[PDB]
Ligand binder design. Structure first.
Ligand code: HEM
Ligand code: HEM
Ligand SMILES: CCCCCCCCO[C@@H]1O[C@H](CO)[C@@H](O)[C@H](O)[C@H]1O
Ligand SMILES: CCCCCCCCO[C@@H]1O[C@H](CO)[C@@H](O)[C@H](O)[C@H]1O
Ligand SMILES: CCCCCCCCO[C@@H]1O[C@H](CO)[C@@H](O)[C@H](O)[C@H]1O
Ligand SMILES: C[C@@H](C(=O)O)c1ccc(-c2ccccc2)c(F)c1
Ligand SMILES: C[C@@H](C(=O)O)c1ccc(-c2ccccc2)c(F)c1
Ligand SMILES: CC(=O)N[C@@H]1[C@@H](O)[C@H](O)[C@@H](CO)O[C@H]1O
Ligand SMILES: CC(=O)N[C@@H]1[C@@H](O)[C@H](O)[C@@H](CO)O[C@H]1O
Ligand SMILES: CC(=O)N[C@@H]1[C@@H](O)[C@H](O)[C@@H](CO)O[C@H]1O
Ligand SMILES: CC(=O)N[C@@H]1[C@@H](O)[C@H](O)[C@@H](CO)O[C@H]1O
Ligand SMILES: CC(=O)N[C@@H]1[C@@H](O)[C@H](O)[C@@H](CO)O[C@H]1O
Ligand SMILES: CC(=O)N[C@@H]1[C@@H](O)[C@H](O)[C@@H](CO)O[C@H]1O
Ligand SMILES: CC(=O)N[C@@H]1[C@@H](O)[C@H](O)[C@@H](CO)O[C@H]1O
Ligand SMILES: CC(=O)N[C@@H]1[C@@H](O)[C@H](O)[C@@H](CO)O[C@H]1O
Lengths: 552, 552
């Protein structure tokens, strides 16, 4: 019915219904015109003949190690490059946001309501004939079928890039401050109203909760000592609501401030590290500022840890998963002479694409022992038994699984992966090809071009029947990996834009904030500007265990 | 104690304590350096020698009517000018925000917490020796004394600019969607979490409330017919909470959606106009879109009314109060090639400066009759008796009072004006001269330079004793007016930046939103781009009564 169902408008033009059976395209600012925004303006034809493809650019970035090594030591150039990556990725995101689960037209409710995840492409109208609009059968393939045929893991497939468990758990810990689905509401609703890197997973989403985790002395977070070691305080001591199975002994119910973080020792590990880091920064600030009271110590520390997080997320985490020889840079000043919006809203599709469960192993090897999921889950006593040092050491040593390439989703979390398919559809996502087009990729012409192999492709073609109806979630996990890479094109070309906006669109990166005073002086500012995953573990973990997001 | 009390840092540099008795200035990006950021960089010395003063620029803008008349008809120039006014005003506001009642250092709580009004200058530390930091006596002059000596009105003083009661009630109606102090919390806390022009005063702040005001047919707001005329529905019909004295008859309790708007027929007038305008836009959208359902009609209409409001607020309201011969422009595209943040946060100081009660007359003349405050307050039957037409006619005819120039605050609202003084101090505002410095004005050197006269100046000098301790609120109302103007320099030089950010930093002004499809097509877009206070009254009010913000 809805004449817009076929998603006729191209190149980011917007489709609007003009009567029951006709439509119109708003080609404004697209660089195109015509009934569908398919015919290019002049300058557009040139830009197109000069735009290297994602894969081309990707090759250049992962080869010529000798040349990059030289560039990386010319500030004028490194900066010039990083600036480009930042701006060119960002113009891909709508800021301020538009569209959410319930609104496929622009609307104020959509903009104002912070409870929704925003949406990079509008949902498919509720009254379209097929789930993807017009193409395909009345019903999408059985999710159980897709799961089992192309997703589930037979034999564990290690990541060729060397991603270890430090990387996998950091990914899980970090993203879980801004992916916090509100299930009381539905998928598509978030509980993280910060919509970004505000460290709510350390400090708590609400004021009431933060106060319960706080010591109110020297700006510090409450903590306990077990052995000679610092761990978070108990639910009993703080009364902060945490999610634990009823069988968990009272002294093992840790607080930390993202309620879900008790369910995996790997999460509880980072929670501890960061808690230690905060109190560490407090002792530093208190030395430079004997006149400062409890509140400002705490507030300044949180601002510093936010800095540290972004610094590390860009220069170590992203650095690693990118595979680039070019040395990425966290430098807010690169943006001070550019058009850029210091705001952000986390997109449903970012959440969806970030379900990297293939990273998980079949057992968790905390050097010495090997634990199954059942043993590992909600079992902090493991953390206490081994200590942080063993753990860092063990998790740095263990390879995580390859994400793209198909058939690597651990059976232990199959319910999750199915849910991902089901909720994708519940939220009315558009097709894989529609998202590719949305992000300046060329659409796939065959399941075989998507996977880069023959078997899974045939299996998919039997279920979906038409490449143009292939769903976004599955395609991501099944997509042909870049050469010796962990992800395919789609993952990286949707992810980077979402990721960099959430990173750089943080108030502390804005000119008013980005100055020494903001962080208690040159000494606190340095804490941000020299932060690394390595030093985070070095300053806070008992030995000074070597780490990396990289299995050496 | 707090070594930062003396506000030693100049030119917008930030002061930070570095030990109990010493301080440091962060001169980052100010254009200055040195212990206090007082000594200019080179390019700064030049910019300074070329910066015409506010009064100079103001002269040029209000004279040469012949030249402006020519410029106003050269698009390339009008646009070029408007662009400049927009960008140059805006760089005066911190965006994203910083500082609020409780935070004089940068902090995350300050940034994240939408319940606070933000603050253009930090508060004075709770442990400073004097209220203004270091200067002045242990205590500020008695508020009752300042009120009575220089504020209260003896003889009504009409505005030399011709501002009428249409202007005064529009100002009150318009600003009361974003000035909504939460008295449960304190001054310095707001209830309008939209922080800007979101038309919550028509539609309601919450979803629950909006639904109660909605008809759920053709996108329309609920309404009743009395006589043959459209007025808002009753509290009884909708159950929407409204503030009315207990003696008000049930059929006179109107709904509208800003709970306070029942307390003045001038407010209830605009509320009705805008309600009519919404349903008018719905009938239009329904014609261009027979396929559209209730929700999208409603949502698109609200987006259009938001446009109309900003269009009118800039090209008629601001136009009028400015006194400029230059024809201001509402054109979001003027910013598309500039650095500008499409966000906003309403500042406590904006609230404070906008207390324009001097505008009010001694009696409200609804042509024929003359009502006192007691008669006018919470008395909608007046609105019913006369109708909208008489009212528009009457209010266009009646001059409002001059705001600056001293001694024009109606005795009827003296409690309010005192409150303003008291709450200013409760919230720890800095001195008038500190705010002047903050907005690139030269500080006043004598009460006599501030007022431009002898009597009130001597009266003030006896109370405050030192010009550097003169409070911001009183100074605004007492300040020497620009020539035949309603406001002085300070009012206009603080106001414009706050006002324009709130206006242009609205999502609909951002490139993604500013296109025809957003508003249901070319026909809806036009409704925005041709809106005027005149046509608003023309399309909605029974005759087609002539109006203006201007007593002719
Ligand atoms: C032992 C390790 C892990 C376990 C036990 C686990 C299990 C789960 C479970 C039970 C859910 C909730 C599913 C639902 O509510 O439908 C979930 C969601 C999710 N998982 Fe994992 N997972 C693990 C590791 C990871 C890792 C390493 C990542 C890396 C990014 C990740 C990414 C996500 C994301 C983004 C969600 C979205 C949930 C939300 O929006 O709150 N997970 N996982
Ligand atoms: C009959 C006309 C008016 C009456 C009876 C009136 C009275 C009041 C009252 C009772 C308050 C709240 C007192 C308090 O919250 O402590 C207030 C606040 C305020 N008034 Fe008016 N006033 C009138 C007209 C105006 C006009 C024409 C303006 C033009 C701008 C204006 C600007 C403001 C502002 C900005 C506030 C503070 C808003 C808030 O935080 O709630 N008022 N006035
Ligand atoms: C080749 C080394 C310098 C340039 C690095 C650019 C990093 C990201 O470049 C990306 O390339 C894609 C295709 O060109 C585009 O679609 C993206 O918009 C762009 O961000
Ligand atoms: C994780 C293993 C259990 C679920 C798979 C059963 C349903 C279909 O899985 C089949 O089995 C083989 C797997 O190697 C493939 O060769 C087939 O192509 C695949 O379709
Ligand atoms: C001759 C100039 C034509 C009108 C343009 C000026 C628009 C506003 O000019 C204002 O002037 C003040 C002092 O220079 C500054 O405080 C502001 O930065 C600026 O916005
Ligand atoms: C370095 C940068 C880039 O290539 O532009 C980048 C940023 C973020 C990512 C990323 C981050 C998280 C998920 C998916 C992708 C990326 F793959 C590359
Ligand atoms: C025209 C423009 C300007 O001078 O830059 C302008 C904008 C807003 C205002 C204004 C608006 C509200 C309160 C105080 C001042 C102004 F007086 C002038
Ligand atoms: C000028 C042009 O290309 N017209 C196309 C038409 O062929 C197609 O049927 C329709 C639906 O996608 O989109 C439009
Ligand atoms: C959403 C939020 O945290 N808002 C807080 C509020 O709860 C608190 O009572 C007040 C004190 O600062 O500040 C604000
Ligand atoms: C969640 C929380 O701590 N709120 C408390 C509340 O009791 C108090 O009234 C308010 C001040 O406005 O903030 C504080
Ligand atoms: C619930 C569960 O699996 N129990 C485990 C147990 O096997 C293991 O000995 C211990 C390690 O400290 O952790 C607990
Ligand atoms: C170099 C300079 O101007 N330093 C001044 C200092 O002389 C003065 O005592 C103080 C007053 O606030 O401000 C600072
Ligand atoms: C603050 C706000 O308006 N939140 C709303 C909430 O009432 C509603 O449950 C949901 C569904 O529209 O959207 C969100
Ligand atoms: C999706 C969701 O949260 N639904 C709620 C609904 O149950 C409630 O009645 C309404 C009131 O505003 O807000 C919305
Ligand atoms: C509140 C009050 O004083 N009552 C007035 C009354 O004096 C006046 O005659 C009437 C005209 O409609 O408006 C009502």
């Amino acid at each position: 019915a809805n004449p817009c169902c076929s998603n006729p408008c191209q190149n980011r033009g917007e489709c609007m219904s003009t009567g029951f059976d006709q439509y119109k395209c708003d080609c404004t600012r697209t660089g195109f015109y015509g009934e569908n925004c398919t015919t290019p303006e002049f300058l557009t034809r040139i830009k197109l003949l000069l735009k290297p493809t994602p894969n081309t650019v990707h090759y250049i970035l992962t080869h010529f190690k000798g040349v990059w090594n030289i560039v990386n030591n010319i500030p004028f150039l490194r900066s010039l490059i990083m600036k480009y990556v930042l701006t060119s990725r960002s113009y891909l995101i709508d800021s301020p946001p538009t569209y959410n689960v319930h609104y496929g037209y622009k609307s104020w409710e959509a903009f104002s309501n912070l409870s929704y995840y925003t949406r990079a492409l509008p949902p498919v109208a509720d009254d379209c004939p097929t789930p993807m609009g017009v193409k395909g059968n009345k019903e999408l393939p059985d999710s159980k079928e897709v799961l089992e045929k192309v997703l589930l893991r037979r034999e564990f497939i290690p990541d060729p890039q060397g991603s270890n468990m430090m990387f996998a758990f950091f990914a899980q810990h970090f993203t879980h401050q801004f992916f916090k689905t509100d299930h009381k509401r539905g998928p598509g609703f978030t509980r993280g109203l910060g919509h970004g890197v505000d460290l709510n997973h350390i400090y708590g989403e609400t004021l009431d909760r933060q106060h319960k985790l706080r010591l109110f002395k020297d700006g510090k977070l409450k903590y306990q000592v077990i052995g000679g070691e610092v761990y978070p305080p108990t639910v009993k001591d703080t009364q902060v609501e945490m999610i634990y199975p009823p069988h968990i002994p009272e002294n093992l119910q840790f607080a930390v401030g993202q309620e879900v973080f008790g369910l995996v020792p790997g999460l509880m590990m980072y929670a501890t590290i960061w808690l230690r880091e905060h109190n560490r920064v407090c002792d530093i600030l208190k030395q430079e500022h004997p006149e400062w009271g409890d509140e400002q110590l705490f507030q300044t520390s949180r601002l510093i840890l936010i800095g540290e997080t972004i610094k590390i997320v860009i220069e170590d985490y992203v650095q690693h998963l990118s595979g680039y020889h070019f040395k990425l840079k966290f430098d807010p000043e690169l943006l001070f002479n550019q058009q850029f919006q210091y705001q952000n809203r986390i997109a449903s599709e970012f959440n969806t694409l970030y379900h990297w469960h293939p990273l998980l192993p079949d057992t968790f090897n905390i050097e010495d022992q090997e634990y199954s999921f059942k043993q590992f889950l909600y079992n902090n006593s493991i953390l206490l038994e081994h200590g942080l040092t063993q753990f860092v050491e063990s998790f740095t040593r263990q390879i995580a699984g390859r994400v793209a390439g198909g058939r690597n989703v651990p059976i232990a979390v199959q319910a999750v992966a199915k849910a991902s398919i089901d909720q994708s559809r519940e939220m009315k996502y558009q097709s894989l090809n529609e998202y590719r087009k949305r992000f300046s990729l060329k659409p796939y012409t065959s399941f075989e071009e998507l996977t880069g192999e023959k078997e899974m492709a045939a299996e998919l073609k039997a279920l979906y029947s038409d490449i143009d109806v292939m769903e976004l979630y599955p395609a991501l996990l099944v997509e042909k990996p870049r050469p010796d890479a962990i992800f395919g094109e789609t993952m990286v070309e949707l992810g980077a834009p979402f990721s960099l906006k959430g990173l750089m669109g943080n108030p502390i990166c804005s000119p008013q904030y980005w100055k020494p005073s903001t962080f208690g002086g040159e000494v606190g500012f340095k804490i941000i500007n020299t932060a690394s995953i390595q030093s985070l573990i070095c300053n806070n973990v008992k030995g000074c265990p070597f780490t990396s997001f990289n299995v050496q």
